[PDB]
Structure 1
Amino acid sequence: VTTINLEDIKEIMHTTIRLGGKPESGEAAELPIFLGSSVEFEAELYDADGTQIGTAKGTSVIFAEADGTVMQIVSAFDDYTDGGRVTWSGAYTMFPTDEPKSVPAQGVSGRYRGLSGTRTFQLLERPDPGTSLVRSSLVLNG
Structure 2
Amino acid sequence: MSTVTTINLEDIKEIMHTTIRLGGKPESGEAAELPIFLGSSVEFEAELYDADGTQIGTAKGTSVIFAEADGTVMQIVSAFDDYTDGGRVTWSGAYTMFPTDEPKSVPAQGVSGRYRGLSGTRTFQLLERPDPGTSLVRSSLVLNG
What band does the TM-score fall into relative to the shorter chain?
over 0.9
Runs of 4 or more consecutive aligned structure 1 residues displaced over 4 Å after TM superposition: none
Give me the whole-angstrom Cα distance separating, in 2, the residues matched to 1:99 and 1:112: 27
Instruction: Tell me the CA shift for residue 96 of structure 1.
Output: 0.3
Instruction: Tell me the CA shift for residue 74 of structure 1.
Output: 0.3
Give me the whole-angstrom Cα distance separating, in 2, the residues matched to 1:13 and 1:88: 16
Counterpart contact for 1:83–1:112, Cα < 8 Å: no
Corresponding residue for 1:82?
85
Instruction: Tell me the CA shift for residue 14 of structure 1.
Output: 0.5
Q: Percent identity?
A: 100
Instruction: Tell me the CA shift for residue 127 of structure 1.
Output: 2.2
1:16 aligns with 2:3: no
Task: Identify the match of residue 121 of structure 2 among 115, 118, 123.
Answer: 118
Shift of the 88–134 alpha-carbon distance from structure 1 to 2, 3 Å rule, reads same
Give me the whole-angstrom Cα distance separating, in 2, the residues matched to 1:100 and 1:124: 10
Give me the whole-angstrom Cα distance separating, in 2, the residues matched to 1:98 and 1:31: 35
Instruction: Tell me the CA shift for residue 83 of structure 1.
Output: 5.5
Counterpart contact for 1:105–1:119, Cα < 8 Å: yes
Structure 1 residue runs of 5 or longer lacking an equivalent are: none
TM-score (normalizing by structure 2)? 0.96
Residues 46-90 of structure 1: CA deviation (Å, up to 9, x unaligned): 001111000000000000011110000000000011261000000
Give me the whole-angstrom Cα distance separating, in 1, the residues matched to 2:72 and 2:93: 15
Instruction: Tell me the CA shift for residue 24 of structure 1.
Output: 1.1
Which SS does the other structure have where 1:111 is aligned?
helix
Counterpart contact for 1:19–1:37, Cα < 8 Å: yes
1:140 aligns with 2:143: yes
Give me the whole-angstrom Cα distance separating, in 1, the residues matched to 2:26 and 2:70: 25
Instruction: Tell me the CA shift for residue 98 of structure 1.
Output: 0.2
